[PDB]
Design a protein around this ligand. Structure first.
Ligand SMILES: [K+]
Ligand SMILES: [K+]
Ligand SMILES: [K+]
Ligand SMILES: [K+]
Ligand SMILES: [Mg+2]
Ligand SMILES: [Mg+2]
Ligand SMILES: [Mg+2]
Ligand SMILES: [Mg+2]
Ligand SMILES: [Mg+2]
Lengths: 209, 163, 288, 172, 49
RNA sequence: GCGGGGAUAGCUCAGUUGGGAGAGCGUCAGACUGAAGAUCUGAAGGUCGCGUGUUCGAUCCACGCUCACCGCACCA
RNA sequence: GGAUGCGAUCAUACCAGCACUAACGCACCGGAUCCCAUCAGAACUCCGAAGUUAAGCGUGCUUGGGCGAGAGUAGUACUAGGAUGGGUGACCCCCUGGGAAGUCCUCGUGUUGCAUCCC
RNA sequence: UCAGGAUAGCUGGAGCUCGCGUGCGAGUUCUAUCGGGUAAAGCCAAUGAUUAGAGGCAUCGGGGGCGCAACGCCCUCGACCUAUUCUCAAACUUUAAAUAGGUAGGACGGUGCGGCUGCUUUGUUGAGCCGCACCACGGAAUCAAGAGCUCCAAGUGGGCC
RNA sequence: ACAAAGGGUGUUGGUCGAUUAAGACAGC
RNA sequence: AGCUCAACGAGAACAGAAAUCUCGUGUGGAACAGAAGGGUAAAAGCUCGUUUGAUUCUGAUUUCCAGUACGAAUACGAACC
């Protein structure tokens, strides 16, 4: 039914997204990109691990779904269903075609066969945020997910706080100075701009960090 | 014709600049064009009359005629093994006075002045300008030196802003 | 809630119009069509007769366009007509005619063509065009009405008639002069002369003084104060025209500019003062 | 700089009477005649903009009529309408732009004798309240926005109605 | 039997064998195509010189 | 593997200019008859294949999947 | 130091909210016989000068939005030329050169021509 | 018309007009000026696609509880608004390279006088052109087995790496 | 004129950790 | 010549998601015959008035290109509107 992934591993064509020109495209195999305690606060999961691609290639939606399922299952089995948050950081937007074998190569432009994601070198594939006590479990879950993807991947322990853009020390210092507003999983840094009356007492600052 | 329309492949070439559409400033119509002036051809996408063919867009030429609303421009065009001096007529909205010879007259005037002074003092000089040549030796005052060394590698810094 | 309309993206994509269009003072289509000159005529300038009507004044000038900006060859104002003897009704048809005649005489004197081109000293209501002379052609200017509505019997056309009688070649037709009949495609010279001499104002004055004397006083207090009656308006306008013809040269003000100009508007705050005020406000907000 | 300036007085700029009838023909002509005999001016017909099958209207079908009145006639018409309404207006009847309005079911209440052939017609009254100086937004040359402080607000319109007409505003 | 459709291969080399030649510009260029009224006035001025 | 039509009560089907869930069998009950047969009446019976989107509103319109039916394609 | 008429550039000039302005002006403003115009003297047109700086115009402020400049992003991304370079490949290092763009941070919020007028 | 032909290009022969470094030139740089929308980048900018949560809101959504109802109250999920957020585009884009493209760098120049016009101007005001006088060290580098012009004609018009 | 994902307690260099002469690991 | 579109907010009996009317915001998110891309806001869009330059004469140029023709288009000249 489906060709082996080796037929579409390498990025050879220009992006071919679903649009008004490309119609009749099947839906991706992966539809959920966040699993675990996605509603947990930013301040509860400081530890972050990334499964990062090291190859320029195409990753299929089926492979993404399988990797997500495996990682989520192992994380739930090991650390529990409320001890982690897993985010798939790649969306398959490239449509892969197929020339179903009228005769020969005449009119060979293929019809949409599937969807996949174009991944660059060093691109994050999977992210897991949890407490310091589940770091090894997260690393092993990512290592298990590794076998579901083609090419080469690497597990990298992020220096950032959870899924935020601040390092752990910087985030701690900003919170100590009261410059951090929790926004779901994200964190908002307070500057020295905007309407002064819009700042609550103690949240107004003369100069930025 | 023959598979390509007059304005084929002009989506970007003939479009107007971002946030620069609408009415045309009066400076465009307050310009003076004379025979022999060098002009740059820049198509205004809002003026559909007297529009030059897309080839002449972005090219400089010389004025050979002046009509009520347009000017004649002579533009070089390469066709196989020769250059053709093609003469076209273009509305002034699509043309702009060129700066390709702004300094020529100034340089000639200065060269004439220098030659006159040299003749007055009884000397022979060359007014030709020269390309930038090697500089002579000089002394640099010793100051504090900062040592640069190769940076130890850290995989965590391979991503912009860190992983 | 209701989505915000004036969004950041809206402002980012916004393109401002020309400043004069934003202020609603210049119609740039008309301006370009008026000023654009044939290129094979090179630096030949096109002069335009600009006439504008304020709430209490009439401004008339001859202007030529340039990259740096418009240049005024000559200008005449209705506020200067009291020197010639017109003290009331400075924003009426007769005042517009007087201003046009004054500007025509002034520009002809500037060009030293007043002797060659004199026009007709008498006003008259018939359509008139100065006859070209052997020595030189008459001075030419193109009317610039502006944003006003070009209706029959407009003060701008009264000023155009004034300029034409002064002796300027202004391309025009007779379909908009006061007295032109819509039903009959003819110009009533009698009615046009009446409007030129302000006889419509005289008729209104007579009707008001016969119907409602108190309204007559309220409406024409200035006329009564200056002691001008309905019957004297024609003679007063004739005298004003005679004075304008006799001496059209502009008068140079004898006032001396002040040595120092006092400032009545607030000056932009300096960076240090702004920073100090901001520090005060921030400290006040934090201390709470 | 004070609110006591005579230039800040609120006056009724205009009163618009509207009669929107789905069908066009004899009924529309009768409604236009009612508007004309009520206002003293020839009314203006309004055509449909789109086609709606449920309403039974068609594009460019003249499905309404209306008239704009200014001055003493408008003031008298507004007084008659408020008399019909018992000088009772809802708080929601006032808009945020210093304008208000209401509606009446029977025009005979305005002083017109019933005619069975004509029938019975309801109408929509709308009053626009403005201060002097609004011409800056209507004039052709130098069109500008009226100062927001000088613009008539909902509170200003409600206060004007209460003071002039001694009316009562109900929340409900 | 299908064949090649098009290519610019070798065309620049062919052109450069003898080109790219620039026609010699003479001091006086042809007046054809210029404003006829201006040309008429110039002819009359030349005749009356 | 492609191109078409179909998926609706226990069963067989209609339906849509989008605003009603409906017919004929099957079951139950009532009416009628001296009793039956036939007949008539009433009741029950619907994730309108699944998941999305457009709409104020979707069985209806569009997209992707699932289940069955029909038709596929010469010279050697 | 400004205003007005006509402009050049066409946001450092725009948008929003607040505060202020001597004089001349610009305005708001009073009427509809006339020219003119509409359902509507609202607009347009004509005739005026009772009243007002309330509005418009102008100026100033906002840890405002936008806009413009700089720093940084970053010698990063990308890229012209070289290799009997590494690598199974995907891709990539090195050599001779060129070299961006968001986020974040700082600053600024018009400059001007002609003519008339007030100071 | 598709295994062909003509046509232009590529080539030979014949020459002719000049020239000897003072060079009407150049598949090259330099200097000064123009045009571009590919690579990249962007969505926290328009169009389109797309993940997640956070804080608020409704006489106008699906529910639970307290209730005969209530424009009565408290919560859940949905819509909506605000500030954020993951990931995208050959037929999207503010911004925007590298390479490459065009023009110019004097003897066919400049300056000062006078003249011609039926064109142009209110105006011997301009626009071109024509005469006289003077100046003009050749006006960036490198190279220049030289530059220009014409006639007749072959073969080729299956390519391939 | 080919070789991959996964592996090796074969061996050879490096990186980050843990115990140790108040005595590191295995057997008594 | 006059006017400004789509859309949204707040209001008005029937009238509601959708009829007509009032105010405010509104960079074009409308419309411009058709495919798509450009272009246009006191307009190139909508309404109205007057009209037939959709007229006559030949030449020049651009696109295609052999620098042939046809089609289409552009700038002048000579007339009448
Ligand atoms: K793998
Ligand atoms: K970018
Ligand atoms: K976007
Ligand atoms: K051949
Ligand atoms: Mg004020
Ligand atoms: Mg700001
Ligand atoms: Mg042959
Ligand atoms: Mg290229
Ligand atoms: Mg128009």
């Amino acid at each position: 039914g489906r060709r082996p992934a080796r037929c579409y591993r390498q990025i050879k064509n220009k992006p071919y997204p679903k649009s008004r020109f490309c119609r009749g495209v099947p839906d991706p195999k992966i539809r959920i990109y966040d699993v675990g305690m996605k509603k947990k606060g930013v301040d509860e999961f400081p530890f972050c691990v990334h499964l990062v691609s090291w190859e320029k290639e195409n990753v299929s939606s089926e492979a993404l779904e399988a990797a997500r399922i495996a990682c989520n299952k192992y994380m739930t089995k090991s650390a529990g269903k409320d001890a982690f948050h897993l985010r798939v950081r790649v969306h398959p937007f490239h449509v892969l075609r197929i020339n179903k074998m009228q005769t020969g190569m005449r009119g060979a432009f293929g019809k949409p066969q599937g969807v996949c994601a174009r991944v660059a070198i060093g691109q994050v594939l999977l992210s897991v945020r949890c407490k310091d006590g589940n770091a090894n479990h997260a690393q092993e879950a990512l290592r298990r997910a590794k076998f579901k993807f083609p090419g080469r991947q690497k597990i990298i322990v992020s220096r950032k706080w959870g899924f935020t853009k601040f390092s752990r020390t910087d985030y701690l210092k900003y919170k100590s100075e009261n410059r951090i507003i929790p926004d779901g999983v994200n964190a908002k840094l307070l500057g020295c701009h905007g309407r002064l009356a819009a700042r609550q007492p103690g949240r107004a600052f003369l100069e930025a960090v | 014709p023959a598979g390509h329309g007059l304005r084929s492949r002009t989506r970007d070439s003939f479009s107007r600049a971002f946030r620069k559409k609408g009415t045309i400033p009066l400076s465009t119509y307050l310009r003076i064009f004379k025979i022999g002036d060098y002009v740059d051809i820049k198509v205004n996408g809002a003026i559909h009359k007297g529009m030059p063919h897309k080839f002449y867009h972005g090219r400089t030429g010389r004025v050979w005629n002046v009509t009520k609303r347009a000017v004649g421009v002579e533009v070089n065009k390469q066709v196989r093994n020769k250059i053709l001096r093609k003469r076209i007529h273009v509305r002034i909205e699509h043309v702009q006075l060129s700066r390709c010879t702004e300094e020529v007259k100034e340089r000639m005037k200065k060269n004439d002045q220098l030659k006159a002074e040299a003749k007055a003092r009884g000397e022979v000089i060359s007014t030709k300008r020269q390309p930038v040549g090697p500089k002579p030796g000089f002394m640099v005052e010793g100051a504090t030196l900062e040592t640069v060394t190769p940076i130890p590698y850290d995989v965590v810094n391979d991503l912009k802003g860190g992983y | 809630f209701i989505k915000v309309q004036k969004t950041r993206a809206y402002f980012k994509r916004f393109q401002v119009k020309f400043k004069r269009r934003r202020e609603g003072k210049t119609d740039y289509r008309a301006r370009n069509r008026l000023i654009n000159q044939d290129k094979n005529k090179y630096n030949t300038p096109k002069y335009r007769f600009v006439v504008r009507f304020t709430n209490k004044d009439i401004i008339a000038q001859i202007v030529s366009a340039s990259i740096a900006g418009d240049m005024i060859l000559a200008s005449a104002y209705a506020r200067e007509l009291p020197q010639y003897g017109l003290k009331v009704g400075l924003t009426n048809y007769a005042a517009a005619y007087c201003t046009g005649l004054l500007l025509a005489r002034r520009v002809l004197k500037k060009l030293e063509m007043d002797e060659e081109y004199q026009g007709n000293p008498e006003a008259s209501g018939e359509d008139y065009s100065v006859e070209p002379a052997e020595s030189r052609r008459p001075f030419r200017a193109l009317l610039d009405v502006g944003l006003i509505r070009t209706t029959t019997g407009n003060r701008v056309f009264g000023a155009l008639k004034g300029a034409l009688d002064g002796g300027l070649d202004i391309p025009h037709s007779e379909k908009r002069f006061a007295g032109f009949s819509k039903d009959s495609k003819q110009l009533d010279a009698d009615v046009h002369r009446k409007y030129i001499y302000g006889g419509h104002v005289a008729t209104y004055m007579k009707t008001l003084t016969e119907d409602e004397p108190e309204k007559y006083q309220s409406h024409f207090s200035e006329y009564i104060k200056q002691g001008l009656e309905a019957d004297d308006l024609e003679e007063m306008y004739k005298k004003v025209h005679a004075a304008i013809r006799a001496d059209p040269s502009p008068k140079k003000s004898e006032k001396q500019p002040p040595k120092q100009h006092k400032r009545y508007n607030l000056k932009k705050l300096t960076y240090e003062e702004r920073k100090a005020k901001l520090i005060e406000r921030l400290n006040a907000l934090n201390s709470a | 700089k004070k609110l006591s300036n005579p230039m800040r007085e609120i006056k009724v700029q205009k009163l618009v009477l509207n009669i929107s009838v789905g069908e066009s023909g004899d009924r529309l002509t009768r409604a236009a005649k009612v508007l004309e005999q009520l206002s003293g001016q020839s009314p203006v017909f309004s055509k449909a903009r789109y086609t709606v099958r449920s309403f039974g209207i068609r594009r460019n079908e003249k499905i309404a009529c209306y008239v704009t009145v200014r001055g003493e006639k408008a003031m008298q018409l507004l007084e008659s309408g408020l008399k019909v309404k018992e000088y009772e207006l809802l708080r929601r009847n006032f808009s945020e732009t210093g304008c208000f309005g209401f509606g009446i079911q029977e025009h005979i209440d305005l002083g017109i004798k019933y005619d069975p052939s004509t029938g019975i017609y309801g109408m929509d009254f709308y009053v626009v309240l403005e201060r002097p100086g609004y011409r800056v937004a209507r004039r052709r040359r130098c069109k500008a926005r009226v100062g927001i402080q000088h613009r008539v607000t909902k509170d200003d319109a409600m206060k004007w109605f209460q003071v002039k007409y001694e009316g009562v505003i109900l929340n409900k | 039997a299908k064949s090649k459709n098009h290519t610019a291969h070798n065309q620049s080399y062919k052109a450069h064998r003898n080109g790219i030649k620039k026609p010699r510009k003479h001091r006086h260029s042809s007046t054809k195509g210029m404003d006829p009224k201006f040309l008429r006035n110039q002819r009359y001025a030349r005749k009356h010189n």
